[PDB]
Design a protein around this ligand. Sequence first.
Ligand SMILES: COP(=O)(O)[C@](C)(O)c1sc(CCOP(=O)(O)OP(=O)(O)O)c(C)[n+]1Cc1cnc(C)nc1N
Ligand SMILES: COP(=O)(O)[C@](C)(O)c1sc(CCOP(=O)(O)OP(=O)(O)O)c(C)[n+]1Cc1cnc(C)nc1N
Ligand SMILES: [Mg+2]
Ligand SMILES: [Mg+2]
Lengths: 831, 831
Amino acid sequence: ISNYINTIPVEEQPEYPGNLELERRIRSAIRWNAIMTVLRASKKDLELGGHMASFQSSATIYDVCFNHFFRARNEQDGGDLVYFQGHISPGVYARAFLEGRLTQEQLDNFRQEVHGNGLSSYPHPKLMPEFWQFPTVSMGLGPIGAIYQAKFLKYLEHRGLKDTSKQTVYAFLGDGEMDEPESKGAITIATREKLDNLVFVINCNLQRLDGPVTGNGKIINELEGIFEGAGWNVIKVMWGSRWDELLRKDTSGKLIQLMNETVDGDYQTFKSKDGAYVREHFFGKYPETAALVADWTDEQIWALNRGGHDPKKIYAAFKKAQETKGKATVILAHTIKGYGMGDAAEGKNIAHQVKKMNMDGVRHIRDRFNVPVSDADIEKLPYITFPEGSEEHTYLHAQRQKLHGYLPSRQPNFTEKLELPSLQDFGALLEEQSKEISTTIAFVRALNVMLKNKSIKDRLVPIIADEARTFGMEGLFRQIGIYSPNGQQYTPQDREQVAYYKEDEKGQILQEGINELGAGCSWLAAATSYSTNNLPMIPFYIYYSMFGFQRIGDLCWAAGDQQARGFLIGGTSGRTTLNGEGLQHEDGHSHIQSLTIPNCISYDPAYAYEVAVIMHDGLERMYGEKQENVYYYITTLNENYHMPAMPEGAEEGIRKGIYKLETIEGSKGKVQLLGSGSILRHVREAAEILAKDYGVGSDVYSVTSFTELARDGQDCERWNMLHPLETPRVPYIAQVMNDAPAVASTDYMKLFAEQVRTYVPADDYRVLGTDGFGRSDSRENLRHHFEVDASYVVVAALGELAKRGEIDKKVVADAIAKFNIDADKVNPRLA
Amino acid sequence: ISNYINTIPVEEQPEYPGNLELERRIRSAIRWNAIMTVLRASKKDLELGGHMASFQSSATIYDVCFNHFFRARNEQDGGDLVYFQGHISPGVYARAFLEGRLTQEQLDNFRQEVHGNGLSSYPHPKLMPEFWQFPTVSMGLGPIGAIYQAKFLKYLEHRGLKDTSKQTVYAFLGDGEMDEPESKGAITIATREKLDNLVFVINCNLQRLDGPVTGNGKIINELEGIFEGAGWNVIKVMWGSRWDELLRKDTSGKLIQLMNETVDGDYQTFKSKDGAYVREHFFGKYPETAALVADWTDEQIWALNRGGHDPKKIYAAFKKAQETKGKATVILAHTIKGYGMGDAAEGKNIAHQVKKMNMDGVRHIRDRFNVPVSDADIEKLPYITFPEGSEEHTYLHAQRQKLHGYLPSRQPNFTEKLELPSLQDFGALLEEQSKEISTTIAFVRALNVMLKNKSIKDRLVPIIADEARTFGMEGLFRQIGIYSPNGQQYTPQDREQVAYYKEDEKGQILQEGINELGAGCSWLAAATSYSTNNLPMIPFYIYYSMFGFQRIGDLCWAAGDQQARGFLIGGTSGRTTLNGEGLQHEDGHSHIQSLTIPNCISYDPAYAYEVAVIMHDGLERMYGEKQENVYYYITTLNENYHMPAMPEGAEEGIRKGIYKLETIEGSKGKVQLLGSGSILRHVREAAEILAKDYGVGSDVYSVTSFTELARDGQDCERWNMLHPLETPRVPYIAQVMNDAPAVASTDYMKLFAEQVRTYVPADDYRVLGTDGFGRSDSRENLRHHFEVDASYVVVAALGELAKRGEIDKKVVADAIAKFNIDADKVNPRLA
Ligand SMILES: COP(=O)(O)[C@](C)(O)c1sc(CCOP(=O)(O)OP(=O)(O)O)c(C)[n+]1Cc1cnc(C)nc1N
Ligand SMILES: COP(=O)(O)[C@](C)(O)c1sc(CCOP(=O)(O)OP(=O)(O)O)c(C)[n+]1Cc1cnc(C)nc1N
Ligand SMILES: [Mg+2]
Ligand SMILES: [Mg+2]
């Protein structure tokens, strides 16, 4: 932690390259327009929302970047990847409009998008596919997202996939946002990887939403201390040029001690008052600091500005960041929240929430920033524009043209044509297996086929969060290598034999250690590379399913917003299947969390051939000609068993979510039996017992996706309600199933199979599931405890028949005794 | 970063207090019993699992703590709160068995708990309510949890609630685990709040599961750098006592330079070779270092120990942390993964996964730690014990008794009786409200009722994540104060006004800034204080609902395991209600995530009187004589509308999940209409349209909890299936509803209401919901887009009647036209 002053002294400050006066004229119009869009929205009295005080404090920082730093997407690369602070979007819009990229009609539709021609509250690529690129409004996600983006850019360079050396990743953050564990929790990775292509820009206005971040302390110093400790290059932009003379004429070093000893709380209060206040409460603290300005006017005291508001001080920091190599840079910019809004919110605790202001307030910002709007127009909350030929218009576009154009901007589809493998290339996985394998083995095998596709082999991005040994993928390190930039500065302990720990700068797999959020962020950068850099990359992130959506659900939702196209493989899944691990490992609900995401396609395959068909279909939809903006989630298991051959013509049903595996004959009745994942074979066992011991036949179905089926049914019923005069549309599951009493069982909570109830064409539909906290035991004991094994499926099936009077209820009661079922033990959900 | 040697020099290290030789005998027995436990489990070949190499590397660190530091639960306080590393549990189980707290049968039932006399794989209070305290296996949660538990202990002391000055929080972490963002993402708070009652003990064995944490670097220095930068007191326990002579005679400074330059990957390998290897590859790097051991035998060189393995160095560290005030301490203990296991795993990349070994491997461990079991008995894998009267038994118990007993241990219920507020105490919220308010305002008013309760007023712990102004709670800052251990070291900006930003050391409100996980960890510490310190505290953590389970779900699952008893308030909930915010804010699925947690009770109330009845019921269930182990989740809204008085006698129905609001007459037909949260008033609007425009009457229901009704339903059919000869149980929802066609509509995705399909006693049950990504617009436009407003309800109900021939389908067709519904607009889920 250094003295409370600028890191870069004037003597080391490079000459500012732009026309400061002209840039202010432009900047004042962007400020004005941003405020007008929020005020107009406010006028509607529709509770639309919006912010003003935030962009006010950071506008000049962005302005200096727009005029001299931000490279836009171009012929060679995707340009600089800017993670704009979410709520300062009105200013981004204000600027795109001045640039002629947005219409006045669109600005008038700020936060009203349902009818088209409107604008999102914040950066949402799903909502504005050709404008926004990175969803940053959920605080914490932007910083770590950016860390891994820069990391991925260096990965494409090392792998010789693309020259990304001219791209800089910028994360624009709030000081309050740095409280999120995700914001600072991964900064040492930027050091390990020497990400000299990443720049963190923290707007240190000392305030968050409720009040000051740490009024009793100094966040700038705390930030400096930890980032410096993590090996980052820290640049403090504390004071503007007006302070430079006052600092040079302080031989007592008392001024510096003052600044050092003053805490955040008193600092923002200073700028919420007036010159007189600062004079007594700040400079007045010492008869030495007091003197320095005894000659200055109270108005010349108030004029002193913070570094984050001085283009000259801002530029020096960004220029320095740009030159620094070997490590990442973090710029801590000192600013005023609600800057220039005077009365309205300048340095006030309520500043964040301000979205309206009387004509007195509007007039103030007009005078304050010398906005060119006459008293005759002002009450009309007019947008300002610069006509062709004007210096403002000329300068604004020239500066952007020298930097390759305008941003943000997004390309929804990649251009190249990939020659994806055919289903036939996964042929061996479609046939009966000699050895008993698991669906996780099937996935690794499918990965290897892909690794053999000339077209995409190098575009595959296997990602692990430690746990590769659990998946039996350790042999892969030697095969394709673990990515390590300037890696392997030692000889692996594993060296001698076969599966050693091979780390190479050209290594293909991303090993992110015990860090699911970081692994997901790596997966996200890869999964959106197709748009960001017009370079399709296909990520396969396999990890313990329990630590997926449950642990990184917020990033998974942002991923959907970002239109990620990739594969999330939830390994060691199923509540009863990862039997010995217990409560915090046994996943019987990940599919419930995943169905909440609109563009995530989830599957719970039972067999190897289903995995192959599913993964093949996914590559096609996402990276084939269709370029479908969706990502996949497949749960795989760690249990081995017999893998039969795929039934002829079963492909469509597998992709849709269900197909009839077989029909067992029986003379005493007929039931329908559904199963998914690892529980399917137990449902097939119940089918044999029922036919063998009770003469009850059945239709057996493998349900590869209860969720895709429920979605289909939902779509059918929705269309039906909307087209009352049309013949009702039949949900796919109802087209496949019949009306005989049905029973389903899975390794997930009951809701997973119960979600298709409305669409099941049977009078009876009994669902068995693994509701309840997990615990350690054998797979058999867990399957009995969670009441999902063959014996429970048999009793559920007999129970439905008994009801219809097809069998005696004493027969059900005897089966319960026969199968050693304790009809009175606590509901596993409460266990 | 300091030199790569011990922080505490020998001349500064205290004299070891215990009997070293006797302590090692006991430690050797514990080591052996931990391994016999896992080995015997592997022999079962049931894929039970377990680890050995991890506890082997950290055993001595825990030993010193059990012998001289760990304070057990006592009559004055809960003692030291130890977050034991999860997978070193066999070691904690081995000690407990030696202390006679566990039986041989229980150890033999390791990881087989479904039948009652087994042991959980890891620390799970829900599974072993009287043994385990904190769930740590989900890596990263232990560290943040521990930080916020230490902060909470200081809070209880400052608030004058309880003297916790004698309790120390210990966080036992792995080094690979430190990569989780949540592991280091909140460490500066320990500095902000001067948590000198927290000790982080990081086991640096240089390896995680797949291999070394950072083979090409030095995590101990990386850890040191960032923690030191965060303001923590860092203590490095690098080398054992055998190194002292060498470091002392090393006059050239060469040994330190060498130790400083060697990277993790090489140090790891050193431990996997032998003395000759070390002599050549380590000391042999420099003529000066080479001369230091030139007179040593390879055997003597091989005996050189790592600090984390030396009791004397370990003790010196914990003793120093003990006297460090003003900040938290991190102990970085250098160890060997697979320590003493030799061949099978010592310093090997495969060490983590080792679950079994050959007789030569068991005999090696027997020799390595001088275990008293004959070469003949080893085959039997015998458990070692200390007979009463023996030195070991006496010493073992004597050390614990001096420290108040044994740990871990847990008290399931609190002992005191609180005088909870009655429901009549909330009578004001039960009457019709004067002005239109929201359910959030109802919650704030309800909180104030409790705040006037003599008994619990000061036991309340309101927690916010920098969103108090949004929830209109900024007025409480002044009323009860914002907790601030260091008081207010400045004059707030709004000081001169009411609702000024008041910070106080006696402040009740926990302001955790933009930090959901930290706020949730504070919530958890408060919500389990009843068990930990036998001091029931009742936390109400309110935040934007979208950032609840989605963002901190892993914590919420652990909270259920930890038997948390408190309230989670999801503010600004509902997809269409937080209209202007958009994609990453509009929550229409948090209830789908919340329903996955077994002991979390979820509600989505529409009216203020419902909020009151639910909170009061929650209060009595968790903190009343019942002491039920569940926590509550209640979604509240930011929309103001008319709040009617509660219908006489509706209390129980509100608690259960559904009650009939009213029935409107109509002779052209009859339907049932269900609504929840904010959409309920639109469902009522539809009931009037249906009646006055179409003559269709209806039964209107307020569904306060679809999830509780589904669970009750599942419990009925489960019980029924199990008792085929008994009187079937009737789901609660089927006791309120009838069989007329039904329509449900909520601000959540369809599944939220569809989950009760099986138990709805009606032929037709159409569900409307907010499936799909949110977008920015007015409430009216969104409710129409998400097809959930009154007009959609009318069309859904009319269509049901037309289908049954009750009405002409042309009537439905006309309605769609009359209400300006686009029957062909894209499915909101795909939009
Ligand atoms: C309704 O909008 P809002 O509350 O103003 C908004 C934009 O949603 C924000 S902005 C915000 C405060 C940000 O303050 P910072 O100091 O980081 O940034 P600034 O001072 O405004 O430059 C919080 C807590 N939240 C709420 C918030 C909380 N938690 C997460 C994870 N994301 C959020 N974004
Ligand atoms: C099946 O057991 P497991 O895989 O051995 C276990 C216990 O589940 C662990 S342990 C582990 C490695 C821990 O290595 P550390 O260096 O932190 O600890 P140690 O070296 O063993 O002392 C990982 C990645 N996981 C998996 C893991 C990953 N991510 C989270 C969030 N929690 C986990 N617990
Ligand atoms: Mg701020
Ligand atoms: Mg380790």
